[PDB]
């Protein structure tokens, strides 16, 4: 149906905000979303859900949509018990030191799980960690790591979130020592088993090496490949062209620019990633609105396109990740 025609009389800021809010449910996103929801609905004995993909496909958008829909589903059940927390999600923190800092991650997980109804679990067995003089939780600096981890486990089992989201989980791979890499994931696994809460990890292809240090990790977890659109198969090309057509029809401009015929250039820059395409189109629309133009020309795309070196590096990384994910386990079942 396209964008509302009334927005043409609205200022440029409103049109840009509308374009930013608008989302596209392309078939790969829909498939990944359905798979993730079905995996969340039944743990099947898996304590981890790994969803890895190329940068700019929409992992963050998928997480956000999953969180919104899960909150919508849990609201009727939240009516009865206000203490239960439906979903907790928090981006992993890239450490400034070589070793990953689990203490800060635990503190930030506790802060994320903060509930305005603090009276339910005001005491986690803490040393003053509970909020005081302000809404936010004030974590005591001198609290040791094991005690604060115990407090996090107590809070998690008290709230019992349906699923725990760790955005950009590839920062877990950042460790000082090569042999020490084997410990962070098993520590997180032990935390998951002790809490019993379903942990979901999101990240890029950098975690693939971190993903399969052993077959036990594959056995005790569910893999979701957020596949990009590949120009090799005509079906993905058709899907990309249709996504371009939808963006063309939904972009708030007086004249709809024919972006379909330049699909080769878009794939050259976006590399089949929907999120990068959306960011590029938002930039182009911003320039169009600031110039108060009426149509989008190829110069507008070229001005804000990613550099050829950036595209080459991104393609090399994603191709290496895909080739590494082509690993096969051909053996006795």
């Amino acid at each position: 149906t396209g964008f509302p025609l009334e927005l043409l009389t609205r200022p440029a800021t409103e049109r840009l905000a509308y374009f930013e809010n608008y989302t596209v449910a392309h078939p790969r996103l829909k498939e990944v979303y359905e798979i993730l929801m079905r995996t969340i609905a039944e743990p099947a004995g898996a304590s981890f859900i790994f969803v890895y993909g190329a940068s700019g496909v929409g992992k963050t958008t998928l997480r956000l949509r999953v969180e919104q829909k899960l909150t919508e589903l849990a609201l009727p059940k939240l009516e009865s018990d206000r203490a239960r927390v439906p979903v907790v999600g928090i981006e992993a923190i890239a450490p400034e030191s070589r070793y990953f800092n689990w203490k800060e991650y635990y503190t930030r997980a506790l802060i994320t799980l903060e509930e305005p109804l603090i009276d339910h679990k005001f005491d986690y067995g803490v040393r003053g960690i509970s909020r005081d003089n302000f809404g936010k939780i004030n974590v005591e600096s001198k609290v040791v790591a094991p005690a604060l981890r115990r407090a996090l486990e107590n809070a998690l089992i008290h709230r019992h979130p349906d699923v725990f989201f760790v955005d950009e989980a590839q920062h877990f791979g950042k460790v000082a020592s090569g042999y020490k890499l084997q410990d962070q994931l098993d520590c997180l696994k032990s935390l998951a088993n002790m809490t019993g809460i379903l942990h979901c990890l999101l990240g890029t292809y950098e975690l693939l090496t971190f993903r399969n240090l052993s077959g036990q990790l594959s056995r005790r977890s569910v893999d979701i490949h957020f596949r990009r659109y590949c120009a090799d198969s005509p079906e993905d090309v058709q899907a990309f062209k249709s996504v371009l057509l939808t963006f063309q029809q939904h972009l708030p401009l007086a004249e709809t620019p024919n972006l379909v015929d330049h699909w080769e250039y878009f794939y050259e820059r976006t590399l089949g990633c929907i999120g990068t395409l959306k960011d590029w189109l938002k930039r182009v629309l911003s320039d169009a609105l600031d110039r108060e133009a009426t149509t989008i020309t190829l110069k507008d795309l070229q001005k804000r396109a990613l550099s050829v070196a950036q595209c080459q590096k991104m393609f090399k990384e994603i191709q290496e990740g895909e080739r590494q994910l082509s690993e096969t386990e051909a053996d006795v079942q």
Partner: peptide
């Protein structure tokens, strides 16, 4: 070429 509903 199928229009996609908002995600």
């Amino acid at each position: 070429l199928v229009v996609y509903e908002e995600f």
